[PDB]
Design a protein around this nucleic acid. Structure first.
Lengths: 80, 108, 46, 93, 93, 106, 94, 99, 79
DNA sequence: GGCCGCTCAATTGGTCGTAGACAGCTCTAGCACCGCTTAAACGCACGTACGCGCTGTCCCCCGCGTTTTAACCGCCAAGGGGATTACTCCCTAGTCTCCAGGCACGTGTCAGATATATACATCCTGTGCATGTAC
DNA sequence: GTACATGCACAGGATGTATATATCTGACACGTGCCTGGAGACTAGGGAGTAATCCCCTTGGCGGTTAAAACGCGGGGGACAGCGCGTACGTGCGTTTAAGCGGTGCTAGAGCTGTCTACGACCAATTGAGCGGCC
């Protein structure tokens, strides 16, 4: 249900602070949750179709990594 | 008649020429792989592996740790104007980010 | 020649620009839609 | 039973050849195994296209030389070409 | 003092490297977003970690480019109107 | 007597040519008898849809000869084509007519 | 030699979609390059999908997943609908 | 018809005219002559197919349009209607195209 | 020097297609660097496919494959 | 009010145990890799012909140098909205845990789907010619 | 008002096809044991909330100079023939890699011993502020 709101204001605040911004206008928080939900929506929609193709109930770390290669946003270390 | 020597040792490489030939031939990159191909490719993987590890080693040693951790790899890619083009869209697990402040934020 | 009709299209679209009565792109029929586009318009109506 | 078939021993040998005192955490080993395997897929992938765009069957040293010359950036291309030409030169004697 | 503890905080999270999002909120969020692609999926624990690293890296990369947008508009303060620029000229939407 | 895979499946797209292209492209050492039928049908559907939109854009601009501009209007209006084709470029297609807001006078 | 290409099928589809309508040789260049690009994209992804499962065969299932990965949105559903209709005709015709 | 005109109006008329039509904006021979300078620095005496040098032009103009179209958006966002080099450098960095 | 042959009017048009209402005078020069560094990518890749083919002449395929590798695919020329 | 000598309540110090996590074995065993066959087809060398691309001579509309001028940028000044920061109080995230169940993997076995050898025929690509569309 | 570009008619060669053949891949049903989903108990680290206040952004106002738009001038971009250097082919050829079947090297798993850092805790010294003695 509510879980998009479960990404805490401080979490997005830290996550932006690593990216090196100094001040956050408070409308960033509710909007950022939308962007992150769109990025997971794309990655999961891809990774679930790899998983369904393999006739398999479990999403493995390889299936999400392959989805990330498929999107041209590659990730190392999680196998492959 | 017998007693082998590995194709890596004949090439003068640490990288596995056999493994690379087996992967090129089974990967369907072509129906045929010429005998010079896996030798040359093994050398290229070794060179890039040497470069990225040497810079990781220097990054770790300058951070006073005797061991490579993903942080010391990420700090070796982003501090090189060449490898940062080769790896311009890779994410390193647990790597963090290159330390940098935009000068307009910097105080007074 | 008949190019006065394309010159009139320019005059109409400039008259609408001097009036300011236009879409956000500045530019000026369901029967013609594909089955996919009918499904997307149905998905927009829901 | 299946086998992981990693590059771990070879990248470990290469580190030990350039920083003889230094270690690899298994996490950094994972990163390096991905990097090697990803550059292999990129180079071999481009070598396949360099065959089809010339309607050759094989990939040979000059296809991989061209794949390197395209795929790498500046100095890394001329260094990698120097390494590949050294290796095939030694292998052919 | 204000903004100085923020600027000292940036140095703290750029020297640090661990995950910035709480595991269980992210774990639930991945399952929540999966539900209407498929019911009843099982997630391998390492896959959720990989997805989390991809997200935190993507968001850091977006905020890094969003900072450029706000600073280009002579603001040290980022706003939704900056995110809409960065995600547009990324070509993402 | 023979019947072509294309006309048997009911496609206008060339199932035999797709079969050879999958077999000879080294996408695999083995190609399933269904795969080139299925792929021909998807190439056909995409070609039918991108042409239907282009032909509509051509007739809506009172021309009967489709030219690259009409394909560029079709591709950039419908957002699922615009996502599929994304970053590709059409020779002499130009750009979708779009005066940005705020520049637009008051 | 022979310049092997899709041009007559593309034109034959156009005359099925809009019987009055005609098409420039530049647009035929585009349609060829577009079909060849989509084809190399889908077969490319199908080959990776076979490797990820350690299969040899490009079966019709491999194309179905490569299609619902590469095509966006509801266009993916309509393409898969056309493919499953087509294979249904073919396997029903023997 | 008029004299002196109202500035900005002929710019909007130009936008409509150059978006409605698909001709190459760069004159062909200057570009045909430019490409050979970029060639001499990496292979001497190259020969270009009549299509290829024009396909490079179609890619260049599609790239430059596809940069000014984002640059414009940075200027509008930056409370301006005028593009400047400080916009172009930014659009590049946000795209990941250099720096 | 043939890069100064990319005329100030040509960059006006080539930006006006992109919809910019007003130019600033520094753009007309600085844009030439951006065009030159874009060409200096696709030419070196296209020439690399050409030399690999052992051709002397750069074909339409030699530049279209460079553009496909650059991730900016061009239709209509060749395939 | 000012000095100093015992008390007992005070930090700061050094050696032990352990756990994470490589590190270097150290097997040891099972499986890929190498060698040496015989075979056959790719790519190479090398002519030959033809497109095709340089390098050539005519020419108008576009490029461009100069001019005014007006609308936009950049600068500044003022001010109230809003983000920071500093606590405070609470809760749900982290953890480790155990069940206990689901299912990913593996192996034995099969059959059906697909490679491939080859003989026909029908499809579609090069040419040529007719005629209407875009300009 | 015109004719170049598409669109149709025809030949013919190549490739798509039907059929028979042989087989190995993928599908199926079996078990092993891995490991993920649920649900619980507790601590306490991070989160939500608030009040206080600073300063940032937004706005409005101004002057300066910069780009636009107009203008006349003239140069060079756009469009037509001649040579020869390539690019595509055809052939003949031999070197190269495949396939196949062995023997050994080596690599992965598992396990072990081993440090060895690095982090708490205990054991054993000491230092000092707490105070009474004295005049």
């Amino acid at each position: 249900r509510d879980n998009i709101q479960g990404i805490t204001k401080p979490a997005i605040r830290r996550l932006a602070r690593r990216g090196g911004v100094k001040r956050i206008s408070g409308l960033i928080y509710e909007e950022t949750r939308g962007v992150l939900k769109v990025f997971l929506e794309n990655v999961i929609r891809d990774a679930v179709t790899y998983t369904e193709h393999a006739k398999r109930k479990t999403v493995t770390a390889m299936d999400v990594v392959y989805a990330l290669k498929r999107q041209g946003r590659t990730l190392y270390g999680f196998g492959g | 008649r017998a007693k082998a020597k590995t194709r890596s040792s004949r090439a003068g490489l640490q990288f596995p020429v056999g493994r690379v030939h087996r992967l090129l031939r089974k990967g369907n990159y072509s129906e045929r792989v010429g005998a010079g191909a896996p030798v040359y490719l093994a050398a290229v993987l070794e060179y890039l592996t040497a470069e990225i590890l040497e810079l990781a080693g220097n990054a770790a040693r300058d951070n006073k740790k005797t061991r490579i951790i993903p942080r010391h790899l990420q700090l070796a890619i982003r501090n090189d104007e060449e490898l940062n083009k080769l790896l311009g869209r890779v994410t390193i697990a647990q790597g963090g980010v290159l330390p940098n402040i935009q000068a307009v934020l910097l105080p007074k | 020649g008949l190019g006065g009709q394309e010159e009139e299209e320019e005059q109409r679209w400039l008259d609408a620009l001097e009036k300011g009565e236009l879409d956000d792109n500045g530019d000026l029929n369901e029967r013609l839609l594909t089955a996919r586009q009918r499904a997307l318009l149905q998905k927009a109506r829901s | 039973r299946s086998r992981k078939e990693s590059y771990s021993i070879y990248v470990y040998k290469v580190l030990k050849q350039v920083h003889p005192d230094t270690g690899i955490s298994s996490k950094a080993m994972g990163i390096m195994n991905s990097f090697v395997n990803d550059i292999f897929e990129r180079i071999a992938g481009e070598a396949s296209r360099l065959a089809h765009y010339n309607k050759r069957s094989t990939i040979t040293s000059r296809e991989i030389q061209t794949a390197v010359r395209l795929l790498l950036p500046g100095e890394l291309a001329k260094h990698a070409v120097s390494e590949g030409t050294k290796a095939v030169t030694k292998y052919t004697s | 003092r204000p903004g100085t503890v923020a600027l000292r905080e940036i140095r703290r999270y750029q020297k640090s490297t661990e995950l910035l999002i709480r595991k269980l909120p992210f774990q639930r969020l991945v399952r929540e977003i999966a539900q209407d692609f498929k019911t009843d999926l099982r997630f391998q624990s390492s896959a959720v970690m990989a997805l989390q690293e991809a997200c935190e890296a993507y968001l850091v990369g977006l905020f890094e480019d969003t900072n450029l947008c706000a600073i280009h508009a002579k603001r040290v303060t980022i706003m939704p109107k900056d995110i809409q620029l960065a995600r547009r000229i990324r070509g993402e939407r």
